[PDB]
């Protein structure tokens, strides 16, 4: 999958890539790269799940439906995956690069937040930092969502509090 | 003449929607006139030069027997199409005096672009004659044929009284429909008149609601 992403990058840099109707060249390139990386992680996770025996305890819990999912097995055993902030890959916080350990204009999967290591194998420092950015996004989203849902729920309940079914079946 | 072709096609669609509106209002319009084909319309209401004519496109309608039995206080109706893009005061005055002298309780005016406010002010004529103005662009597509739009049926006075009696309702306790709603304009609702709305529910097959015009 990394080789496929490299080939797509080579085509894009040679301008031979044609833009999808309705978006710019860069957006089409990013869409293709993200799709390839996501399907790579899914395929690796499917291989890992198929390998696991019926006596595997995590497999048993997933089979029962008590706890866990396929994505958890994939991330713990096969590959953590692609880290995203605001629905996009890790942005260039520095000038044209994500971290000062990469060169300028690096669009490779490892440069913009693809974590190819599982949790069992452990994360390299750059992958660790990108994962921290993603987790921070998740925490902020949860903290915003709870307050927004509380406000909306109060307003809805106040609006509809007086609606009742009467004895002629009208509401 | 691609512009002329699109103009005549749009005019034909507008004519079809106007006939459909008049038929739905409860007047005697035969089904054949509604479904008139394009070639027949071009042969009849368009000249040899290709420019459609609007003066002979106007027509008159009368209530049917069932509507007379149900609505015994409504009579003949007149529909007029104008030629000039902006209808002047003189033309509107001729239209209103013709409506008055022909004893029509309702008359629909159709215009190309706009009505000057100097004529908009005199649009409300001497009662009980009511003037309703429509735009051709707004009448190209019959909105009532959209699947989102359910069935609207105007209720008679006796039906409204029975409805309020059976449900023990006051006038204001009914759901409201504005007297500018596109279907309300289509059916010519006046304030105080109740439309029954038949809807295809998904919990029951049929659901009947009611909306009072405001």
């Amino acid at each position: 999958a990394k080789k496929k992403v490299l080939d797509v990058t080579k085509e894009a840099q040679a301008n031979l890539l044609t833009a999808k109707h309705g978006m710019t060249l860069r957006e089409s390139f990013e869409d293709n790269v993200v799709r390839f990386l996501n399907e790579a992680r899914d395929k690796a996770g499917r291989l890992a799940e198929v390998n696991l025996k019926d006596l595997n305890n995590v497999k048993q819990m997933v089979m029962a439906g008590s706890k866990g999912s396929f994505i958890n097995i994939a991330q713990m055993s096969a590959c953590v995956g692609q880290q995203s902030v605001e629905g996009k890959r890790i942005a260039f916080g520095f000038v044209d690069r994500t971290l000062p350990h990469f060169s300028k204009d690096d669009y490779s999967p490892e440069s913009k937040g693809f974590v190819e290591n599982s949790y069992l194998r452990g994360l390299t420092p750059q992958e660790f930092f990108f994962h921290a950015m993603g987790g921070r996004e998740g925490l902020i989203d949860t903290a915003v969502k709870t307050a927004e849902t509380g406000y909306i729920q109060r307003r809805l309940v106040k609006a509809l509090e007086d609606i009742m079914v009467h004895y002629d079946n009208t509401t | 003449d691609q512009e002329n072709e699109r103009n005549i096609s749009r005019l034909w669609r507008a004519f079809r929607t106007v006939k459909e509106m008049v038929k739905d209002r409860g007047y005697f319009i035969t089904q054949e006139e509604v479904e008139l084909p394009l070639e027949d319309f071009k042969a009849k209401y368009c000249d040899s030069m290709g420019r459609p004519q609007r003066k002979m496109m106007s027509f008159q309608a009368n209530p049917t027997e069932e509507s007379i039995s149900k609505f015994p206080d409504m009579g003949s109706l007149w529909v007029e199409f104008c030629d000039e893009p902006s209808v002047g005061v003189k033309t509107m005055k001729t239209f209103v005096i013709h409506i008055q002298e022909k004893n029509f309780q309702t008359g629909i005016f159709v215009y190309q672009n706009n009505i000057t406010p100097s004529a908009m002010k005199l649009v409300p004529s001497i009662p009980p004659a009511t003037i309703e103005t429509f735009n051709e662009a707004a009448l190209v597509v019959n909105i009532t044929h959209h699947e989102l739009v359910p069935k609207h049926i105007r209720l008679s006075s006796d039906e409204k009284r029975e409805l309020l009696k059976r449900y023990r309702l006051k006038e204001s306790q009914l759901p409201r429909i504005q007297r500018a709603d596109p279907v309300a304009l289509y059916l010519g609702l006046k304030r105080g008149e109740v439309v029954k709305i038949i809807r295809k529910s998904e919990t029951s097959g049929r659901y009947a609601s009611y909306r009072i015009c405001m």
Binding site: G93, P100, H101, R121, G122, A132 | -
Partner: protein
């Protein structure tokens, strides 16, 4: 085991949380939203350290949307009710010809796009053709409107001398420097408008400063010492109006300073007691003593005063420039998530030094003064900045950077001073002020003996460090300052970190490159042009996260949870 670093006010241990703020004397350009009539705004929060220390914001705004035809640039001078056109400002500073003004703003004759975008300004300002007339125009637009006609000029001159770009100078006779800086600001604004550079990132940690106990107490004492000196005057004038003998003991009032400082440290409200409800709150907090690590993390805490109820998420997100300076996973999890941060283990904050010796060094080493700089005769010249003040230009910046680096690495220049060379932008920025957050790194040199890049530090230095540590548990002591003074390690802040290439580990990245399948997958980066090396990656974590075992085998929110939950752990907080 107690580390200090806190005050004892009324028997209570109080710690001053670091306060994050936007850096001063930096030109920042921001795009504006569609509804606003101004499209781009270039602003500088000018402030002088050795003076009134008053904040005066200059905004050079660009009116008109993209599709609009009248695109005029207007500046917002302080104490003026209207946004004066920029060309009027140049004419008031003493630059009458339009050719000179356009030379000051634009540095390239071939850049006809900028001239096309800038012509509406001179078209608008054609009505004024004289310096005295321009000063009269500014006075007429002057918001005071309480001055007679021929005395408006004095008010306009005072505005342009003491309120316009105070960080350059407050004296008279330095109009050319201020005109050059205004041209530079407008040049940056137009570069952003011309779709040549992106709008400045508000979250860039190199554009932020942390006020520690020092500056906070400094500005608090100034207000308190101003009140005392003013009170001496009212007494001196009263005791001189009554014709009585003056005694110094009666004039002074120690309760003023004492009570003000005690109240400001006892309560979070940071200022005067009557100025409460308008002063920042929560600056000083009761020191946490539940556990030792809780005390440490509290003593290394930074707060960002953005609302906390605001619904914007960008200030809270973990920025890229936070690498190695704040802990990636050590934030509170409620409404202060991301707004409250914790320093990394090895990150430091500068205390500030005097910039005059560096200015003397630059003048000695061949910096051309800005007064006699003609861009046409020197097109490819590099602009040199010191603490945000444009001091001149240099024609051979490479040799200048080489000698500055050599001076800083031998101890002649203070290691806290940060020097950045932007080759693409052709700029040289030197910062010495307080508040900058930096970290140490290994320096990598050519090493012609081995023919490849290698760390400057070798086994001899490690042996000397080990010997000194063993003796502590006689030779010349080999401490951290020994490494610093011998040019083995370096201090880099987020600004300088933009212009360097760092190796994550020395073994796998410096030398030119059957593997254990259990080991994690690592890359060689296929590039050898490194300038620095990380001392250890694990130093990106803070005090609370450094307790977690195998944090890189964990999901990140779990690490954040543990960092927050280890401060509630029960143990021995002190031995006494």
């Amino acid at each position: 085991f107690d580390m200090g670093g806190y005050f004892i006010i009324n028997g209570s241990e109080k710690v001053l949380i670091a306060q994050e703020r936007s850096a001063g004397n930096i030109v920042q350009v921001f795009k504006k939203a569609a509804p606003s009539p101004i499209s781009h705004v270039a602003e500088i929060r000018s402030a002088l350290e050795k003076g009134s220390r008053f904040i005066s914001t200059l905004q050079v705004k660009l009116y008109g949307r993209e599709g609009s035809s009248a695109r005029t640039i207007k500046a917002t001078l302080p104490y003026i009710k209207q946004d004066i056109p920029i060309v009027i400002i140049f004419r008031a500073l003493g630059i009458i010809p339009d050719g000179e003004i356009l030379e000051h703003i634009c540095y390239d004759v071939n850049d006809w796009q900028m001239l096309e975008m800038l012509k509406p300004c001179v078209e608008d300002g054609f009505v004024i053709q004289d310096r005295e007339t321009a000063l009269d125009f500014i006075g007429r637009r002057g918001t005071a409107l309480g001055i007679k006609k021929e005395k408006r000029i004095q008010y306009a001159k005072d505005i342009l001398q003491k309120e316009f770009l105070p960080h350059i100078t407050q004296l008279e006779g330095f109009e050319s420097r201020k005109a050059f800086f205004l041209g530079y600001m407008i040049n940056r604004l137009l570069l952003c408008a011309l779709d040549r550079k992106d709008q400045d990132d508000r979250d860039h940690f190199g554009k932020k400063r942390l006020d520690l106990a020092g500056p906070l107490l400094a500005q608090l004492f100034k207000t308190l010492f101003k009140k005392l000196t003013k009170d001496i005057f009212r007494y001196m004038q009263r005791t001189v109006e009554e014709a009585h003998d003056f005694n110094m003991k009666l004039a002074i009032n120690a309760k003023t300073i004492t009570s003000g400082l005690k109240y400001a440290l006892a309560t979070g409200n940071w200022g005067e007691q009557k100025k409460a409800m308008s002063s920042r709150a929560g600056v000083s907090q009761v020191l946490n003593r539940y556990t030792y690590s809780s005390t440490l993390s509290h003593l290394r805490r930074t707060n960002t005063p953005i609302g906390r109820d605001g619904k914007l998420a960008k200030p809270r997100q973990l920025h890229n420039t936070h690498w190695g300076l704040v802990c990636p996973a050590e934030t509170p999890e409620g409404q202060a998530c991301g707004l409250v941060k914790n320093l990394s283990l090895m990150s430091c904050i500068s205390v500030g030094t005097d910039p005059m010796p560096i200015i003397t060094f630059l003048s000695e080493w061949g910096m051309e003064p800005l007064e006699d700089y003609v861009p046409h005769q020197s097109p490819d010249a590099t602009r040199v900045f010191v603490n945000g003040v444009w001091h001149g230009v240099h024609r051979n910046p490479a040799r200048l950077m080489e000698t500055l680096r050599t001076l800083r690495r031998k101890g002649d220049i203070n290691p806290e001073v940060s020097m950045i060379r932007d080759i693409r932008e052709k700029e040289l920025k030197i910062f010495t002020d307080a508040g900058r957050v930096y970290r140490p790194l290994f320096i990598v040199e050519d090493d012609e003996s081995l023919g490849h890049k290698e760390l400057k530090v070798r086994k001899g230095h490690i042996a000397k460090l080990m010997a000194t540590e063993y003796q502590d548990i006689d030779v010349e002591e080999y401490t951290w300052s020994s490494l610093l003074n011998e040019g083995l390690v370096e201090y880099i802040d987020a600004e300088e970190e933009e212009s360097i290439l760092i190796a994550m580990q020395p073994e796998d990245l410096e030398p030119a490159e059957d593997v254990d399948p259990a080991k994690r997958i690592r890359v060689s980066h296929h590039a050898t042009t490194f300038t620095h090396c990380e001392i250890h990656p694990s130093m990106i974590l803070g005090v609370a996260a450094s307790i977690i075992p195998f944090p890189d085998h964990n999901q990140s929110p779990r690490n954040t949870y543990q960092s927050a939950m280890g401060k509630q752990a029960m143990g021995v907080f002190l031995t006494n």
